[PDB]
Amino acid sequence: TLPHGHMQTLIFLDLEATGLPSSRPEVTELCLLAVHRRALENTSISQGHPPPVPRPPRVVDKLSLCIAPGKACSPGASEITGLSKAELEVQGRQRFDDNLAILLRAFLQRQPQPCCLVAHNGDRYDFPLLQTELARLSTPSPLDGTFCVDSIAALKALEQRKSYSLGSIYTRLYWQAPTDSHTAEGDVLTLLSICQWKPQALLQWVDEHARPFSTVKPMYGT
Amino acid sequence: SQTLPHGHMQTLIFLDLEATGLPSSRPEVTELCLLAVHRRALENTSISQGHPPPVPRPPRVVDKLSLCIAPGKACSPGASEITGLSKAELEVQGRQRFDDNLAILLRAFLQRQPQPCCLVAHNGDRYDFPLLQTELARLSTPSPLDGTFCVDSIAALKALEQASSKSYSLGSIYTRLYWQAPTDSHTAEGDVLTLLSICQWKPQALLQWVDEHARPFSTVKPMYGT
Ligand SMILES: Nc1ccn([C@@H]2O[C@H](COP(=O)(O)O)[C@@H](O)[C@H]2O)c(=O)n1
Ligand SMILES: [N+]
Ligand SMILES: [N+]
Secondary structure, three states, X not given: OOOOXXXXXXXXXXXXXXXXXXXXXXXXXEEEEEEEHHHHHOOOOOOOOOOOOOOOOOOOEEEEEEOOOOOOOOHHHHHHHOOOHHHHHHOOOOOOOHHHHHHHHHHHHOOOOOEEEEEOXXXXXXXXXXXXXXXOOOOOOOOOOOEEEEHHHHHHHHOOOOOOOHHHHHHHHHOOOOOOXXXXXXXXXXXXXXXXXXXXXXXXHHHHHOEEHHHOOOOOOO | OOOOOXXXXXEXXXXXXXXXXXXXXXXXXXXXXXXEEEHHHHHOOOOOOXXXXXXXXXXXXXXXXXXXXXXXXXXXXXXXXXXXXXXXXXXXXXXOOOOHHHHHHHHHHHHXXXXXXXXXXXXXXXXXXXXXXXXXXXXXXXOOOOOOEEEEHHHHHHHHHHHOOOOOXXXXXXXXXXXXOOOOOOOHXXXXXXXHHHHOOXXXXXXXXXXXXXXXXXHOOOOOOO
């Protein structure tokens, strides 16, 4: 008895932004990687020690975008993300605007439903912040029929002290350092690899814990 | 007093697609990847030094779209072997056809890029661009690529390698420049990233060639009629 049925699409998501929550941050980068349930189930299962790092499914949809913020990145944010408001502006990046919502809506529409976003620390950071950015637009949110889960909770359950930083998890499971860029897409690819460690168990946990994105409280309001 | 045909391109969009077969089969697209890079990000690439130069690092600021598309006809056995895609598997995974919503998606992606914008595709003039024109011609939307320019990177790399003086396949060029094999060949995103690397070899010369040779995508003749 699942709350919202079997999820047919998992969208691995990462957001980068200008700072930490009390700073009222703005998104500077966004990556979505949509995988069908069956592509995850077709991940080959490894019983060796260490398990090889899974490769991504052949069939994936990917969207990665840089976004000009209205406010400057903190020094810590620019160091960690490698992005700056000034550099995003000189490369002509656009704000989080109605055309971006058109793009997101059309990308989501290509995915079989029910669909669930999966983000590392999404419950405390990525999801509330995405909710805030979408709430500013006059466009109705394209995510109001989408579900979501936090992969920190997923991996805590799948593993049954331990750090739950993305890199710490990857190294604990695969016993090699992560090699992805430190970009939103690199973080999404590292998360996909972690989620392919026990893909059937991950899907089961996601099905049991999916909640409507419409219930995510905005990080901050107008 | 000689002028560029369409001004300085502000965005290069590296593009590749996979499809069900070769042109005489009247193929349909099964995968599409666009990778948009601002002129300034390309010009920022560290100068290639040494023999071989290291494979350039992709710019930090890029926009990427990669999509799988259900075709209405089967892939040839050779197309499915090379690309790793089949109609049956794309359908099992619920992929949608090339439709109006996909054109709306592409348009909104393109609208985030500063203009003038130029598509860059390897063998684009004979394959990718005519095929995309055919697919877009079936739709009820305007073309999302009205206003966008295009060029074929085979001609470009022929020019640039002649200047620093052969197969001009994507892999042959990459291996000549960098002395190792590309990865993820014959996948849309893997081949886009290989093309980006080749075009980062001599970015200023590439941008000058592209500026001089860009043509409107609206002038590309469809591969076949509908
Ligand atoms: N030997 C070959 C080479 C290319 N092709 C077709 O050319 C398309 C594009 O080629 P690339 O993979 O080089 O981009 C393939 O997706 C495939 O449909 C083929 O069907 N047989
Ligand atoms: N990988
Ligand atoms: N599993």
